[PDB]
Amino acid sequence: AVYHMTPPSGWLCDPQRPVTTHGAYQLYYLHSDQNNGPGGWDHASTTDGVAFTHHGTVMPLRPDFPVWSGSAVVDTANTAGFGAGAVVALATQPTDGVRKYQEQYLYWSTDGGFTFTALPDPVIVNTDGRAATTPAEIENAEWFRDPKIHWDTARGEWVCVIGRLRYAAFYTSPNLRDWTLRRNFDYPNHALGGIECPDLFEITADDGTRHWVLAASMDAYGIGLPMTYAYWTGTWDGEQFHADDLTPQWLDWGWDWYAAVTWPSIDAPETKRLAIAWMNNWKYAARDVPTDASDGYNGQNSIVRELRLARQPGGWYTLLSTPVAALTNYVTATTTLPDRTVDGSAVLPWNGRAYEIELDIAWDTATNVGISVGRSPDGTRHTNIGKYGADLYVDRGPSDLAGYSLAPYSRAAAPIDPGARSVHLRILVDTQSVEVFVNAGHTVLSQQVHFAEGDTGISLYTDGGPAHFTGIVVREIGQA
Numbered sequence: 001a002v003y004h005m006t007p008p009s010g011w012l013c014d015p016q017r018p019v020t021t022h023g024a025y026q027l028y029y030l031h032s033d034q035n036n037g038p039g040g041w042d043h044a045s046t047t048d049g050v051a052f053t054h055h056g057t058v059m060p061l062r063p064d065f066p067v068w069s070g071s072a073v074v075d076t077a078n079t080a081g082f083g084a085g086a087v088v089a090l091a092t093q094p095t096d097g098v099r100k101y102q103e104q105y106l107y108w109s110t111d112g113g114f115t116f117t118a119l120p121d122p123v124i125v126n127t128d129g130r131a132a133t134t135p136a137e138i139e140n141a142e143w144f145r146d147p148k149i150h151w152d153t154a155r156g157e158w159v160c161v162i163g164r165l166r167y168a169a170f171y172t173s174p175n176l177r178d179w180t181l182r183r184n185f186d187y188p189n190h191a192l193g194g195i196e197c198p199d200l201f202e203i204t205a206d207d208g209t210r211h212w213v214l215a216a217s218m219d220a221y222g223i224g225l226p227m228t229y230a231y232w233t234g235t236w237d238g239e240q241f242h243a244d245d246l247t248p249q250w251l252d253w254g255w256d257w258y259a260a261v262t263w264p265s266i267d268a269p270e271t272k273r274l275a276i277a278w279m280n281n282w283k284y285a286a287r288d289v290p291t292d293a294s295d296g297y298n299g300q301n302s303i304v305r306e307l308r309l310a311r312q313p314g315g316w317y318t319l320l321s322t323p324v325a326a327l328t329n330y331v332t333a334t335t336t337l338p339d340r341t342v343d344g345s346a347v348l349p350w351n352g353r354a355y356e357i358e359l360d361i362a363w364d365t366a367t368n369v370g371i372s373v374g375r376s377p378d379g380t381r382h383t384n385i386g387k388y389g390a391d392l393y394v395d396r397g398p399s400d401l402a403g404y405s406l407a408p409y410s411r412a413a414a415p416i417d418p419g420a421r422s423v424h425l426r427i428l429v430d431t432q433s434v435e436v437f438v439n440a441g442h443t444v445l446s447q448q449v450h451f452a453e454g455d456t457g458i459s460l461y462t463d464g465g466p467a468h469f470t471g472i473v474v475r476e477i478g479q480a
Ligand SMILES: OC[C@H]1O[C@@](CO)(OC[C@H]2O[C@](O)(CO)[C@@H](O)[C@@H]2O)[C@@H](O)[C@@H]1O
Pocket: 128, 140, 164, 166, 167, 168, 169, 184, 186
């Protein structure tokens, strides 16, 4: 990957809420030596959200005691008593290697988050795991993980949300050590499944109003919805979360944007948040990937994106996405191609593997319009991004690679007005990925794609009528 974060070696997994110290974002992420094997937390820092400097393990795997996901916060006021400005993290670990004993352990750092000391006793104990007995009780006790810490400024206390089976649990604390159980968050459509890597935060909308957001990684493939990040805007009163609407909204419609996490931007923490996710899906994450053989590592994170909350007619709010601004600093070349009308297919006179391409497509009677990236000259390999019916789809099927096929998870789709006869696309292509930001960023589709060395072409196509492709600009991306 030219511009996506990958671990120096080994298996990469869930990212953890970055903390800002030493004038940089300290990113933690699950890492193991063996694919899908036991591991812990590794450290990487970034000052712009594009380039990462890896620092190794901070919270190591220990005999039958792996470190699972959680989150880290900067205790500025020294509320926990480990010193002002100390970095405190909570993470789930299976006590005694027992799955039904998974609970929250606290780790702390007094050097900006480069070295951590473990607090021997868990701050939030899995009591269900000790009293469980029936098959249901066990299953319930075996889903008590991924704590996300947030400072409820209005109440002057800490609030933590923990993922569970089809519901979320909440705890409050004045020192990050002593927690008090609160009211759970329940939602009606369990076919949405989930509640892994929950997220809880406050953000100011474009109208100046303050809002709470509760989100989590889901699995709604069964009912035709994403397996990415779903969120509920609302409010937290100190006892429970009140969702404005129980039907969640989605942050990504692609195949690979899992365990995503968000964090305040250094420049505008109240209105602009940054977000990153693991580019994988458990439907197939447990396997070898091309990079295992070529470079001895498995997994990459998504591009970092910026998030803002925008008011919608009727008083509701939605999130908007856009690639992190600094990526502009890694552009090594900018190519513009002439507008053109296509009726059938046309190959563009450009080739590459790491770049961002923007374009506008307008049509009338065509029942299908789109663009192919990672197109091999033999014409057999390519990933298609286009508009059909009420879908803005991304079909990676033709890019399936022998030995690493992603079938049958080929055609991803985001909703788009059926009446749309024009669309703007912003597409980020790298050696093992494709990320599509549609129109104003309300919908995004992120997917890993195993491109072959020669999958460098780009073509345009339409079915049932001509289309006008304009504003074509290709920005090549390297390192700089
Ligand atoms: O089994 C989940 C289901 O049970 C409910 C009952 O209302 O809550 C159970 C759950 O609440 C806790 O006290 C807090 O996390 C747990 O100890 C207990 O298992 C529902 O809220 C939930 O849907």
